Design a protein around this ligand. Structure first.
Ligand code: HEM
Ligand code: HEM
Ligand code: HEM
Ligand code: HEM
Ligand SMILES: [Ca+2]
Ligand SMILES: [Ca+2]
Ligand SMILES: [Ca+2]
Ligand SMILES: [Ca+2]
Ligand SMILES: [Ca+2]
Ligand SMILES: [Ca+2]
Ligand SMILES: [Cu+2]
Ligand SMILES: [Cu+2]
Ligand SMILES: [Cu+2]
Ligand SMILES: [Cu+2]
Lengths: 106, 106, 106, 106
């Protein structure tokens, strides 16, 4: 799985979550998103390939995934409580984080 | 200040950003919006007055401002970089967060 | 309050959490800690008093409080599950965030 | 890599850090520790092999690595700044987290 595969996984599972009916479905999808986000975190994206590995952009890029992983964690806790709609609402709000990184680095 | 006063401050400064010509103007407005958003986050809106404090609705309400504050943060970084048009675009994109909360709780 | 009082409030409420008998007590202390952290966030620390307000040091100083606030939120959620023992553990573990900011800026 | 291989990497790099006479070398070693800790967080340890992942011990276990990675991150930043003494100090303080987990789950 490269960065592009990780992004497919994140995108697909956000949709799985908003379509889901029960807490197990949401938990399973969030867990897949967590793995994909942790995987993507070490990647050098195409738009930063020509920058220093030690650049502020690469630092910030990696931190974008820390934010995303943190928020997935909080959503996963809601799903573990069986709070389907609250967990779905939290997953929906990950989109701001997806967008924030895309605006800078995609 | 109270919730509605915070909301007027958010709306007024969005208009200020829209009309701004330089990065200082935008930075000042975003700074004011951050403070308004943080104040608003502690409020109990009229439609949730008779809901419990850790209720799904109050939890969701508070988290809406977390999302808004994060978006202000990113817009403020652009204004800090002297990127007026980019910061204005980011400020514009805030509106979906305003809209989403209004749809539920206003 | 000033920065020093905010710091005493953080310390004192950690003690309150360690000693707590129930979830309400934990929630109340965590809530106080959030307020203290957000107040401290607005302060200029002695070690950075002569630096610019948008300096990378001031930027990082302010963000240290965001990390702390996020961890307080997570702890509050455990208390709200009635998981007092786990919430107490999470609160004790906040100390690494305290210590990290201290190494740089205290 | 498995739990034990990652743990040896962690221990090896701590010794490297303490041996080192320069910040740049410390930075190199901390980077490898960060990768190793993150690769270890996936694991179920022998002593908790009977538990589910959601259990209080396994939740506490997983968060142990979040604490460690956050500390490695802060150490890395001090090394980035060419602060050899501060980074080495931060590194040796990692052991408290190493030991706190061992005391409970090794
Ligand atoms: C759940 C949140 C996210 C979703 C749903 C998501 C979704 C996607 C999708 C579908 C793509 C490929 C389609 C396209 O290029 O337009 C993509 C690309 C990309 N994303 Fe994300 N993303 C998320 C979070 C993030 C985050 C947090 C970062 C940075 C920290 C990021 C960085 C990138 C980059 C650099 C690309 C371009 C990859 C390439 O061109 O190979 N994404 N994202
Ligand atoms: C930049 C984004 C936002 C803007 C520009 C904005 C603006 C406004 C305005 C102009 C009002 C009219 C109410 C009045 O002043 O009497 C209002 C009300 C309200 N807004 Fe927002 N808002 C924003 C974000 C949010 C968010 C994120 C939430 C919830 C998470 C929210 C919740 C509410 C509520 C509950 C009211 C009704 C208050 C009352 O009736 O006293 N707003 N907002
Ligand atoms: C719950 C975690 C924390 C605890 C228990 C705590 C506790 C304390 C205490 C007891 C002091 C000494 C107060 C005095 O001199 O009167 C202090 C000082 C200080 N703390 Fe913290 N703190 C925490 C988190 C933080 C964080 C996250 C930051 C930075 C983001 C921070 C920045 C500072 C600074 C800059 C001082 C020096 C204050 C001065 O000299 O005026 N603290 N803290
Ligand atoms: C930098 C800090 C750390 C160091 C230096 C360290 C060191 C070690 C070493 C050398 C081993 C023995 C590996 C072997 O079998 O050859 C070990 C095992 C172990 N460590 Fe750590 N560790 C650290 C962090 C942690 C953390 C944060 C946790 C828990 C969150 C943890 C939990 C464990 C457990 C459960 C074992 C038993 C492995 C087994 O028997 O399969 N360690 N550690
Ligand atoms: Ca697909
Ligand atoms: Ca939608
Ligand atoms: Ca009013
Ligand atoms: Ca008014
Ligand atoms: Ca007691
Ligand atoms: Ca969190
Ligand atoms: Cu960093
Ligand atoms: Cu929450
Ligand atoms: Cu920032
Ligand atoms: Cu957790």
């Amino acid at each position: 799985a490269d960065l592009e595969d990780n992004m497919e996984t994140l995108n697909d599972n956000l949709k799985v979550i908003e379509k889901a009916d029960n807490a197990a479905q949401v938990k399973d999808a969030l867990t897949k998103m967590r793995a994909a986000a942790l995987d993507a975190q070490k990647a050098t994206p195409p738009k930063l390939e020509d920058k220093s590995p030690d650049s502020p952009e690469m630092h910030d890029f990696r931190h974008g995934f820390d934010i995303l992983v943190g928020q997935i964690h909080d959503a996963l806790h809601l799903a573990n409580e069986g709070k389907v709609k609250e967990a779905q609402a939290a997953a929906e709000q990950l989109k701001t984080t997806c967008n924030a990184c895309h605006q800078k680095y995609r």
